[PDB]
Design an enzyme around this catalytic site. Structure first.
Site, mmCIF file in Angstrom:
data_model
loop_
_atom_site.group_PDB
_atom_site.id
_atom_site.type_symbol
_atom_site.label_atom_id
_atom_site.label_comp_id
_atom_site.label_asym_id
_atom_site.label_seq_id
_atom_site.Cartn_x
_atom_site.Cartn_y
_atom_site.Cartn_z
ATOM 1 N N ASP A 35 0.837 -1.201 0.000
ATOM 2 C CA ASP A 35 0.000 0.000 0.000
ATOM 3 C C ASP A 35 0.871 1.250 0.000
ATOM 4 O O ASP A 35 1.357 1.671 1.054
ATOM 5 C CB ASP A 35 -0.908 -0.009 1.217
ATOM 6 C CG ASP A 35 -1.805 1.195 1.293
ATOM 7 O OD1 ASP A 35 -1.905 1.909 0.278
ATOM 8 O OD2 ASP A 35 -2.409 1.394 2.371
ATOM 9 N N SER A 199 -0.559 15.537 -12.058
ATOM 10 C CA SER A 199 -0.794 15.184 -13.450
ATOM 11 C C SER A 199 -1.031 16.443 -14.272
ATOM 12 O O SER A 199 -1.552 17.441 -13.780
ATOM 13 C CB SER A 199 -2.010 14.261 -13.542
ATOM 14 O OG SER A 199 -2.374 13.988 -14.876
#
Length: 330
Positions: A35, A199
């Site tokens: 994770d 992004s």
């Protein structure tokens, strides 16, 4: 040193991925959920409330000659999905794919919430976010990667998750055969303890690319792709009959649909998520309403590049003094 381990989807939907981890002496092998959105290595154990164990493999520290109670240490964690667990702490030897850390904090669950009990395939979590998020008190502990870093050939790990198929976690090296083209690296902020990056935009299907900054986290422990409501609406508007359902808890779409791809930007590079990766199947057995793999982050407080996004790429988690992330197509 290096390590290399195969990671395998837990079910036919890629709801999560499990990677075998050796703990203790002699080794006890547990299948952990790696994770990158959390920083605790915790396991089902001989200490877990018996009614909360339902098929998981447990760690038994009393059978490990290298286990040592970390006296006074406790841990307690709550995840974005509402699940939680807590317990005490041992140090022990932990190996992943041939890479060994001695003295790793292994957090032994005394309690786990129902969603963990109900998932017999996940024996615990191995956190790979920054150690500043580790929950052990009163002495915070380091992640497996943080402990291994100095010994690694290169201070990196990579995630190569498969679509409906096994993939690989590598530690200490970048397998140049595992991706196509070049790796595009992008800046990371560690201020929230996550692999947080920005992004450069998105496209839906064959549509034109929209340049827009989207701050979010690279999180292997989250199944889906969570993005701003504007982006998610633009995606699902291209699917006839798709709608956001408050009763189901997100966007659903007719199972008869063919989904468009979704592209996200990494600098000037582009990662394409095929439409099939966005199908999470019937909302309930036999339903013709299917659950979408791109969902709004509006209720989270952060955008999350979960498995739906990461499995479309070869992803480098660069733990150099200034961390960065790398993405390549594959």
């Amino acid at each position: 040193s290096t390590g290399s381990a195969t990671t395998t989807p837990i079910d036919s939907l890629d709801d999560a991925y499990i990677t075998p981890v050796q703990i203790g002496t002699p080794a006890q092998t547990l299948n952990l959920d790696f994770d990158t959105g959390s920083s605790d290595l915790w396991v089902f154990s001989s200490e877990t409330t018996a009614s909360e164990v339902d098929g998981q493999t447990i760690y038994t520290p009393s059978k490990s000659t290298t286990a040592k109670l970390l006296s006074g240490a406790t841990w307690s964690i709550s995840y974005g999905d509402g699940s939680s667990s807590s317990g005490d702490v041992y140090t022990d030897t932990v190996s992943v794919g041939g890479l060994t850390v001695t003295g790793q904090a292994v957090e032994s669950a005394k309690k786990v919430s129902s969603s963990f009990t109900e998932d017999s395939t996940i024996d615990g979590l191995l956190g790979l976010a920054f150690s500043t998020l580790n929950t052990v008190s009163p002495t915070q502990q380091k992640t497996f990667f943080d402990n291994a870093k100095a010994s690694l050939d290169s201070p990196v790990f990579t995630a190569d998750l498969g679509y409906h198929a096994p993939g690989t976690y590598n530690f200490g090296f970048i397998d140049t055969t595992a991706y196509t083209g070049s790796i595009t690296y992008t800046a990371v902020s560690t201020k929230q303890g996550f692999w947080e990056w920005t992004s450069t935009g998105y496209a839906v299907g064959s549509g034109t690319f929209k340049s827009t900054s989207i701050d979010g986290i690279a999180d292997t422990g989250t199944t889906l792709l969570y993005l701003p409501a504007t982006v998610v609406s633009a995606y699902w508007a291209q699917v006839s009959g798709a709608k956001s359902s408050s009763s189901v808890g997100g966007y659903v779409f007719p199972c008869s649909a063919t989904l468009p791809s979704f592209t996200f930007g990494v600098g000037s590079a582009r990662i394409v998520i095929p439409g099939d990766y966005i199908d999470f199947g019937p909302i309930s057995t036999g339903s013709s309403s299917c659950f979408g793999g791109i969902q709004s982050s509006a209720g989270i407080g952060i955008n999350i590049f979960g498995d739906v996004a990461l499995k479309a790429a070869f992803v480098v988690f660069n733990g150099a003094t200034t961390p960065t992330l790398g993405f390549a197509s594959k």
